[PDB]
């Protein structure tokens, strides 16, 4: 019994393409009525899962859901057990809330022996990626046990400021992504870099302008920054934290390779059937999904995937299915999880729209097509960020996905988590 990661020989999942909806999503985020509504708003979700223990984080805003204020940030971990009718869910076992809510930004979780490290960024100038021209660079680690004890005071919660940073040539590092992986006694966190634009070494001749007649050569170089005349260009990567020493807080930034170099976006690195898989959101001209399995971690080189059917929507400047360099910084985070390696099958919640951010639809794509899909809400329900993680329930693969949707009787976009069972039959 229990819940384990993707290891061993699971049950055979369907492989062919069919239209019969064999997917049965089940909501596991039953919230009480909000009678007496107000201008509430929940954003910046977080969901990590590993070896049967999950985490969660959210920022509750009062007012406009983008330019609002902060009231509370619930960051807590818990176990993953069966509700009883052979349906997995996320049971909470510990909850932590910081005192000042307008300090924590861009958290990142990871699993360890009997803890759950949550690496967040501390800033006193607002959101970092919007005001990075004055950020200090301090990073705070939060440890939350997955099984608290009576009167520990040092086992259920422990924080410490990260002092030493091994930044190679950048200026500031920051955790950027939902979750990471473990390698026995080493922790890895997804992150982004901040390099000076003037100190960037990138020849303006490797831009893929094969068939992009209506474009410009320097679009690749201009797209690496949040703005055309920006002062810092982003760079995805990983943060290494070797906790096997504990002599001094170490921060080792592992930059990504130059293959398909895009702007910095929330990245996710997870384990699947022994080999770690990597994901990177598309907040640049390259609107297609950026999947890939990692073969080398210390020097980060990921074998990308040439998927030409799954992408994310955006604005008019850089809409979906765009494969040409254009100066733009927009998109939505929609990841997936590798459920099989022999056939290289993935599964994730992606949006189905050209220039809007509605209609969240669960979909399973092998490499260049969609096998079976299933919608979660109506064709008009809005959605911004989706986080997908898969696990096992004693004989078979299950996937719990956090999909922010617009509830009818709530009038607020609350992060609701579903539960989809991958079937063992086609049609």
């Amino acid at each position, epitope marked *: 019994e229990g819940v384990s990661n993707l290891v061993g020989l699971p049950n055979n999942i369907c492989l062919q393409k069919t239209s019969n909806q064999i997917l049965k999503p089940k909501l596991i985020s039953y919230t009480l009525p909000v009678v*007496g509504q107000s201008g509430t708003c929940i954003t910046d979700p977080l969901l990590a899962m590993d070896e049967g223990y999950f985490a969660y984080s959210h920022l509750e805003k009062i007012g406009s859901c983008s330019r609002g204020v902060s009231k509370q940030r619930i960051i807590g971990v818990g176990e993953v057990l069966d*509700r*009883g009718d052979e349906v997995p869910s996320l049971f909470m076992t*510990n909850v932590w809330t910081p005192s000042n809510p307008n300090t924590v930004y861009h958290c990142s979780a990871v699993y360890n022996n009997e803890f759950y490290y949550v690496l967040c960024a501390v800033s006193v100038v607002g959101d970092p990626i919007l005001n990075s021209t004055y950020w200090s660079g301090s990073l705070m680690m939060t440890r939350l046990a997955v099984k608290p004890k009576n009167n520990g005071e040092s086992y259920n919660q422990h924080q410490f400021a990260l002092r030493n940073i091994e930044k190679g040539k950048y200026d500031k590092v920051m955790p950027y992504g939902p979750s990471g992986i473990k390698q026995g006694d080493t922790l890895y966190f997804p992150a982004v870099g901040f390099l000076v634009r003037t100190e960037f070494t990138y020849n303006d001749s490797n831009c893929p302008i094969a068939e992009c007649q209506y474009s410009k050569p320097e679009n690749c170089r201009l797209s690496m920054g949040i703005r055309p005349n920006s002062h810092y260009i982003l760079r995805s990567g990983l943060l290494k934290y070797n906790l096997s020493d504990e002599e001094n807080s170490k921060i080792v930034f592992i930059e990504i390779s130059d293959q398909r170099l895009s702007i910095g976006s929330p990245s996710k690195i997870y384990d699947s059937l022994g080999q770690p898989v990597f994901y990177q959101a598309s907040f640049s001209w390259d609107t297609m999904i950026k999947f890939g399995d990692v073969q080398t971690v210390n020097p980060l080189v990921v074998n990308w995937r040439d998927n030409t059917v799954i992408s994310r929507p955006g604005q008019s400047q850089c809409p979906r299915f765009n494969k040409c360099p254009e100066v733009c910084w927009e998109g939505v985070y929609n990841d997936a999880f590798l459920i099989d390696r022999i056939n290289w099958i993935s599964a994730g919640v992606f949006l189905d729209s050209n220039q809007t951010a509605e209609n969240p639809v669960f979909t399973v794509f092998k490499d260049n097509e969609v096998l079976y899909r299933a919608q979660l809400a109506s064709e008009d329900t809005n959605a911004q960020k989706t986080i997908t993680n898969c696990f096992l329930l004693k004989n078979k693969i299950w996937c719990i996905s956090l999909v922010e949707i617009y509830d009818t009787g709530d009038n607020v976009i609350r*992060p609701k988590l579903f539960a989809v069972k991958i079937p063992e039959q086609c049609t």
Partner: nanobody
Amino acid sequence: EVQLVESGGGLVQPGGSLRLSCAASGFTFSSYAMSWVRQAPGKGLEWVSYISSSSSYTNYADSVKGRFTISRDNSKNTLYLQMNSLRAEDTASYYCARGLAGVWGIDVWGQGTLVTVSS
């Protein structure tokens, strides 16, 4: 289907002592976790207590750290709460669930129970 049956009333003098019970049926109560949650009109969720499976770990909130203590009666499925020395800031509807605070819940909130502390 999981059925949650709340109990306990309200309209008590300030500083009194009430006992809020909540029984359940369906899932095996012997090995799970229970937590009281409350919400006043105008605010959201806030955990009130927490308890483990074998009545080993017990957690509370900073506002009610020393007010009451949760219990467990695994023999006869129940969930008591011996509230003591309540204040006016405790007038809210209490509920029972299977998660500490979260935004979670693996069953529709059945009826709830209101507790009024005033005059």
